[PDB]
RNA sequence: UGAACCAGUACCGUGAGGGAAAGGUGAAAAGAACCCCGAGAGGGGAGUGAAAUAGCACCUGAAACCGUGUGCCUACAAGAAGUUCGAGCCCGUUAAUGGGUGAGAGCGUGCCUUUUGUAGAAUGAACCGGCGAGUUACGUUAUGAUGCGAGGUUAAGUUGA
RNA sequence: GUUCGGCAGUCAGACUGCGAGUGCUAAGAUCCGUAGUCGAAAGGGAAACAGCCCAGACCAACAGCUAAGGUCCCAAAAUAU
RNA sequence: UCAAUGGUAGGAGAGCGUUCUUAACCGCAAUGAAGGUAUACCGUGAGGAGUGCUGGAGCGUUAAGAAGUGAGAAUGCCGG
C-alpha cells in the first residue's frame, strides 16, 4: 500500500540538450516555458529533487518582441551594499550591449528560488548573437509557440 | 507520608527524552526545547497526513499533465474528457502510468479523444 | 560587554579551533640522542658541534 | 498485472505482487478473490478496460495485523493545549498472484 | 600477552583544557617524537607527562619489555577531576572562588 | 531536633542575637608485603579479598560539564533548527512493512503569566537534580450510599487491649 | 421549555459591516443598538493577517468531489473559448 | 444502522501512577530483589512489562483502605 509513489529519476537522471531560439520572441512567453524545460517540468518524470535540469541553449538573443515603449520604461535597478547603493541598468540599454541578464535575471524570477533553481538557473546556456560553440554534443531545437 | 516517587518522576523524564531523541545538538543535552521538538513535528506531520496527500497529488496531476503535455494535452480538457469518458474516472493510478505506458497512457488518452469526440 | 545568550559549545570550540599549539622542530637522535633544536644548543653543550655549558 | 480498488484505494497489482490493504472479513489466510477489478492494467496485451469482467484478483490472502502506533497531541493554542489520541492500523498484507490477464 | 601500556595520574593542578592544547601533538607520533617535544615543550603542563609517559614505558617493561624502541602512542586522554575551589576575595564582598584544575592523565602506547 | 556527624559547632556581628555543611568501604582491614616508574605524591605490576570500577570523603551510581574513539553528512550556505518525502551511504533489530543516517526538496513565528490582541523589542526562566504549595479540627448545607423507619438516636462518661 | 437543587465564573472586550451619537460627519478614536467574527475555532483565500471572505478539525488513509478564490513561472489547474 | 466527537476560564463523569498499608491472596529473590543502563515491544493516554548489562538486598504482586500523593516554569530554594 505504502510506496505506490515513484521517483524513477532521483539517481538515474537524464541529460539532454536543446538549442532553443527565436530572434525576436517575447520575453515572458519564452521565459516561463524555457523555465518549464529547465525544470524538466514538461518531462514526465518530476520529483521535487529531480535534477532534470535541461541544457537550455539560446543563441541570437538580440530581440524581444517589445510591446509598448519597454525599451524606454522597463528600467532595471540594483543596490550595492554601500549606502545609497542605487545602480541602475536601464530599459533599452545593455540590450544591445549584453542581452544576457536581460534574460536570465527574469528567469531567476521564473524559477523556484532555491539551490536547485539556482542550480539549473545557474546552468543556463546563453548566447546573444552567436552560432554558439561546442556542438560536440548533440543539441536539438525546441518549439516556436508559447504553447 | 513524606514520600517522593522520584524514580517514577524521572521515568516520565526518561520516557519523554528517550522518545525525544534525534534532533539538533544541544536539545537532548537539555530538556524542554526537545519537548516541542517532537511535538511541533507531529503537529505538521498531522498536517502532512493531509498535505503529502495534497502534494503527492500535485506530483500525480503534474506529471500526468507533463506526459499529457508531451502529447500536447492539457489536464483540464483531459480530465474533462475523463468525466466525458467511461466507467473509469480513475485518477492517480492513471497518474502512476508515467512509467513506460504509451499503450495505457496514450490509448486511454485516445479514449478521452473519443470522449471529447 | 556582557554577553547576551549562551554560547553553544560547538561554536565555542569553533572559537577554539585556531587556538592550538605549534610543534617545535626537534633534532632527533644525534648519536643516539640527546636532542637540540636547530639554531639551538644540545643538552651536552653542543651548538655548532662544540660543548658550551 | 491489473488494477483493483478494494477499499477507497485503487491499486496496481502485478500477478504476484505482494500488497497491503486494510482489514477485510478474511480471518487467517483463506485466499479469496475480489471482483471490482477495473483494468487489464500493466497490460502489454489487450487494451481499453472501462469495466472489466472475469479478470478478477484471485487474492492469495496472507495476514492482517497492527500497523504502527503513531500518536496525537493536538492544535496548540497558548494557555494549556490538550491531549492525546494515537493509534495504529489493522493493516493486511496479502500477496496477489493470479489475475486473469 | 597484551600491549596495555597505560599509566595515569591524579591530583595535579594543570589546566586540562591546556593539556588538550598539549595532546594533539602527542596522539599520533612515536615516543621519540613524544619525549622530543615533551622535553622541548615551553608549557608547564607537559614536563610531568613523563611521569605517566615514563611510568607507562615502565609499565611496558614493568611486566612486558615489549617493543620498547618501537612503542608509538596508542591513545591518551587527560581529564578534569574534582577541581578544588577556593573562596577568592574580590572587592566589596565580591569574592568568587577558584577551580583548581584536577586531572587524570592517561596514556596507552603500543606497536604499529 | 538548628543539630543522626564532638551543634548551638564552625562562622557572622562589639553586643543583644543569628546560624551553617557533612552518615554508609569491605563480612572481617583481612588497608594493597614486595617489585618498578616517579623529587615526592600518585601510578603500575604483584598479591589482598566473593569481588580493587572495592583502595580509605570507600555501597549504588544518573544529571548538567568535559572527553576519547566510532558509521554517515557538511567548507555556494543566510533554518524556532522542524516535519514529510527522499537520492545516496552505513549497519543488521523487545524479528520487526528494520535501524542509523541524511544531501536535496515542500511547508512550517519556542514555552509560560497577563491581555482585546503578544511570535515578540511584555514578563520570566543559565542548566541539571532534590525539595517545594488546596489540608485537616469543629459546624452547616447539598448530593448520594447504607441502616432502620413516625421511630430514629446515645452524647459525655463507664467497662475494656 | 418550565420548576427545584447544587456548582460556577463572567463585569474591561475588541474588530468587521449596518443604523445612531460625539469629534475636523479626523481616526486602527470614543459611546450606543444591531448581526457576525475572534477571543475561545484550525484549513484555504487575499505576500505574511485574531477580527474580512469561505469553510467548523475524533483518527487513519498514496481516495474522489468541491467552497470562496484561482489556472504565463515560482506555485497546481485555461499561453481556454 | 443512524446521529455526534474545535474547545479556554467553567461544570460533570471515569481511569492511571507513587508510598504506606500486620491484614490476606502469594509469590520472588544470589541461578541475583530493589535501583541504574541500552532496548528496533505493547497500551487511546497516563502507563506496562521482555531482554542485555551494573548491582548485591529487599521487592513485587492482586484487591481494598489510608495519604505530607502525582513537577518546569515563582528573581522559587539548596547542591553541582
From Swiss-Prot, chain B:
What's the family? Belongs to the bacterial ribosomal protein bL20 family.
Q: Sorted alphabetically, which Gene3D superfamilies does this protein's record hold? A: 6.10.160.10, Ribosomal protein L20
**Name of the protein described by the UniProt record:** Large ribosomal subunit protein bL20
List, alphabetically, the GO terms of the cellular component aspect. ribonucleoprotein complex; ribosome
The function of this protein is: Binds directly to 23S ribosomal RNA and is necessary for the in vitro assembly process of the 50S ribosomal subunit. It is not involved in the protein synthesizing functions of that subunit.
Q: Name one GO molecular function term.
A: rRNA binding
Q: Which GO terms describe its biological process?
A: ribosomal large subunit assembly; translation
Family annotation (InterPro entries)? Ribosomal_bL20, RIBOSOMAL_L20_CS, Ribosomal_protein_bL20_C
Q: Which UniProt keywords are present, listed alphabetically?
A: Ribonucleoprotein, Ribosomal protein, RNA-binding, rRNA-binding
Keyword Cytoplasm appears in the UniProt entry: no
Recorded hits in HAMAP family, A to Z, give:
Ribosomal_bL20
Q: Which Pfam families match?
A: Ribosomal_L20
Determine if rRNA-binding is one of this entry's keywords. Answer: yes
Q: Which NCBIfam families match?
A: rplT_bact
From Swiss-Prot, chain C:
Q: Give the residue ranges for region: Disordered.
A: 1-22
Q: By its UniProt entry, which Pfam families does this protein fall under? A: Ribosomal_L32p (PF01783)
Q: Which NCBIfam families match?
A: rpmF_bact
Family under the similarity heading: Belongs to the bacterial ribosomal protein bL32 family.
Q: Does the keyword Nucleotide-binding apply?
A: no
What keywords are assigned to this protein?
Answer: Ribonucleoprotein, Ribosomal protein
| Family annotation (InterPro entries) | Ribosomal_bL32, Ribosomal_bL32_bact, Ribosomal_zn-bd
> Under the GO molecular function aspect, what terms does this record hold?
structural constituent of ribosome
The protein's name is Large ribosomal subunit protein bL32
**Gene designation per UniProt:** rpmF
Source organism lineage?
Bacteria, Bacillati, Bacillota, Bacilli, Lactobacillales
Q: Which organism is it from?
A: Lactococcus lactis subsp. cremoris (strain MG1363)
GO terms under biological process: translation
Q: Where does this protein have compositionally biased stretches of type Basic residues?
A: 8-19
Show the PANTHER family listed in the entry: 50S RIBOSOMAL PROTEIN L32, LARGE RIBOSOMAL SUBUNIT PROTEIN BL32
Give the domain of life.
Bacteria
From Swiss-Prot, chain D:
What's a GO biological-process term for it? Answer: translation
Q: Which GO terms describe its cellular component?
A: cytoplasm; ribonucleoprotein complex; ribosome
Instruction: Quote any Pfam family the record assigns.
Output: Ribosomal_L21p
InterPro entries in UniProt: bL21-like, bL21-like_sf, Ribosomal_bL21
Q: Which domain of life is it from?
A: Bacteria
Alphabetically list the UniProt keywords.
Ribonucleoprotein, Ribosomal protein, RNA-binding, rRNA-binding
Any one Gene Ontology molecular-function term assigned to this protein's record = structural constituent of ribosome
Q: Does the keyword Electron transport apply?
A: no
Extract the PANTHER family matched here.
50S RIBOSOMAL PROTEIN L21, LARGE RIBOSOMAL SUBUNIT PROTEIN BL21M
Known function? This protein binds to 23S rRNA in the presence of protein L20.
Q: Which family does it belong to?
A: Belongs to the bacterial ribosomal protein bL21 family.
Q: Quaternary structure per UniProt?
A: Part of the 50S ribosomal subunit. Contacts protein L20.
HAMAP family noted in UniProt: Ribosomal_bL21
Q: What is this protein called?
A: Large ribosomal subunit protein bL21
**What's the source species for this entry?**
Lactococcus lactis subsp. cremoris (strain MG1363)
Curated annotation (Swiss-Prot), chain E:
Alphabetized SUPFAM superfamilies for the sequence: Ribosomal protein L22
The membrane spanning regions, by residue number, are none
Tell me which InterPro entries the record gives: Ribosomal_uL22 (IPR001063), Ribosomal_uL22_bac/chlpt-type (IPR005727), Ribosomal_uL22_bac/org-type (IPR047867), Ribosomal_uL22_CS (IPR018260), Ribosomal_uL22_sf (IPR036394)
Q: Which residue pairs form cystines in this protein? A: none
Does the keyword field hold RNA-binding?
A: yes
Q: Name one GO biological process term.
A: translation
Q: Give me the Gene Ontology terms describing cellular component.
A: cytosolic large ribosomal subunit
Question: Pfam families in the record, alphabetically?
Answer: Ribosomal_L22 (PF00237)
Annotated GO MF terms: rRNA binding; structural constituent of ribosome
Q: Which domain of life is it from?
A: Bacteria
Name the keywords, alphabetized.
Ribonucleoprotein, Ribosomal protein, RNA-binding, rRNA-binding
Family to which this protein belongs:
Belongs to the universal ribosomal protein uL22 family.
**What does this gene product do?**
This protein binds specifically to 23S rRNA; its binding is stimulated by other ribosomal proteins, e.g. L4, L17, and L20. It is important during the early stages of 50S assembly. It makes multiple contacts with different domains of the 23S rRNA in the assembled 50S subunit and ribosome.
- What binding partners and quaternary form does the record give? Part of the 50S ribosomal subunit.
Cross-referenced PANTHER family = CHLOROPLAST 50S RIBOSOMAL PROTEIN L22-RELATED, LARGE RIBOSOMAL SUBUNIT PROTEIN UL22M
Quote the protein name from its UniProt record: Large ribosomal subunit protein uL22
Q: Which organism is it from?
A: Lactococcus lactis subsp. cremoris (strain MG1363)
Gene behind this chain?
rplV
Amino acid at each position: 500500500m505504502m510506496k505506490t509513489t515513484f521517483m524513477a529519476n532521483a539517481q538515474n537522471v537524464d541529460r539532454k540538450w536543446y538549442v532553443v531560439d527565436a530572434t525576436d520572441v517575447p520575453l515572458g512567453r519564452l521565459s516561463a516555458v524555457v523555465a518549464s524545460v529547465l525544470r524538466g517540468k514538461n518531462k514526465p518524470t518530476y520529483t521535487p529533487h529531480a535534477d532534470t535540469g535541461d541544457f537550455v541553449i539560446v543563441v541570437n538573443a538580440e530581440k524581444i518582441k517589445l510591446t509598448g515603449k519597454k525599451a524606454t520604461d522597463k528600467v532595471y535597478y540594483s543596490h550595492s551594499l554601500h549606502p545609497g547603493g542605487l545602480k541602475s541598468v536601464t530599459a533599452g540599454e545593455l540590450r544591445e550591449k549584453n542581452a544576457v541578464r536581460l534574460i536570465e535575471k527574469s528567469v531567476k524570477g521564473m524559477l523556484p528560488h532555491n539551490t536547485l533553481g539556482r542550480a539549473q538557473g545557474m546552468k543556463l546556456k546563453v548566447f546573444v548573437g552567436a552560432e554558439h560553440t561546442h556542438t560536440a554534443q548533440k543539441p536539438e531545437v525546441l518549439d516556436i509557440t508559447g504553447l | 507520608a513524606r514520600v517522593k516517587g522520584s524514580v517514577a518522576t524521572r521515568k516520565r523524564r526518561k520516557r519523554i527524552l528517550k522518545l525525544a531523541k534525534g534532533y539538533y545538538g544541544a536539545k537532548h543535552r537539555l530538556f524542554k526545547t526537545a519537548k516541542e521538538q517532537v511535538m511541533n513535528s507531529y503537529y505538521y506531520a498531522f498536517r502532512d497526513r493531509r498535505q503529502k496527500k495534497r502534494d503527492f497529488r500535485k506530483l500525480w496531476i503534474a506529471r500526468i499533465n507533463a506526459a499529457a503535455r508531451m502529447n500536447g494535452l492539457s489536464y483540464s480538457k483531459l480530465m474533462h474528457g475523463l468525466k466525458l469518458a467511461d466507467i473509469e474516472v480513475n485518477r492517480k493510478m492513471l497518474a502512476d502510468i508515467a512509467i513506460a505506458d504509451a499503450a495505457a497512457f496514450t490509448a486511454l488518452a485516445e479514449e478521452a479523444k473519443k470522449a471529447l469526440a | 560587554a556582557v554577553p547576551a545568550r549562551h554560547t553553544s559549545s560547538a561554536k565555542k570550540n569553533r572559537r577554539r579551533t585556531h587556538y592550538k599549539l605549534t610543534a617545535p622542530t626537534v633534532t632527533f637522535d644525534e648519536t643516539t640522542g640527546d636532542y637540540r633544536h636547530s639554531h639551538r644548543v644540545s643538552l651536552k653543550g653542543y651548538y655548532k658541534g662544540r660543548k658550551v655549558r | 498485472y491489473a488494477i483493483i480498488k478494494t477499499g477507497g484505494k485503487q491499486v496496481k497489482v502485478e500477478e504476484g505482487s505482494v500488497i497491503y490493504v486494510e482489514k477485510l472479513n478474511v480471518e487467517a489466510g483463506q485466499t479469496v478473490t475480489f471482483d471490482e477489478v477495473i483494468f487489464v492494467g500493466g497490460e502489454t496485451t489487450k487494451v481499453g478496460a472501462p469495466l472489466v469482467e472475469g479478470a478478477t484478483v484471485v487474492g492469495e490472502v496472507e495476514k492482517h495485523g497492527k500497523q504502527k502506533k503513531v500518536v496525537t497531541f493536538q492544535y496548540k493554542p497558548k494557555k494549556h493545549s490538550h491531549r492525546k489520541q494515537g493509534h495504529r492500523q489493522p493493516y493486511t498484507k496479502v500477496v496477489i498472484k493470479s489475475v486473469n490477464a | 600477552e597484551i600491549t596495555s601500556a597505560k599509566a595515569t595520574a591524579k591530583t595535579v593542578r594543570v589546566s586540562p583544557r591546556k593539556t588538550r592544547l598539549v595532546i594533539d601533538l602527542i596522539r599520533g607520533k612515536r615516543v621519540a617524537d613524544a619525549i622530543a617535544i615533551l622535553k622541548f615543550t615551553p608549557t608547564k603542563a607537559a614536563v610531568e607527562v613523563e611521569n605517566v609517559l615514563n611510568s607507562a614505558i615502565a609499565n611496558a617493561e614493568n611486566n612486558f619489555g615489549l617493543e620498547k624502541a618501537n612503542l608509538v602512542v596508542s591513545e591518551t586522554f587527560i581529564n578534569e577531576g574534582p577541581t578544588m575551589k577556593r573562596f577568592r576575595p574580590r572587592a566589596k564582598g565580591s569574592a568568587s572562588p577558584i577551580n583548581k584544575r584536577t586531572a587524570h592523565i592517561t596514556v596507552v602506547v603500543a606497536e604499529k
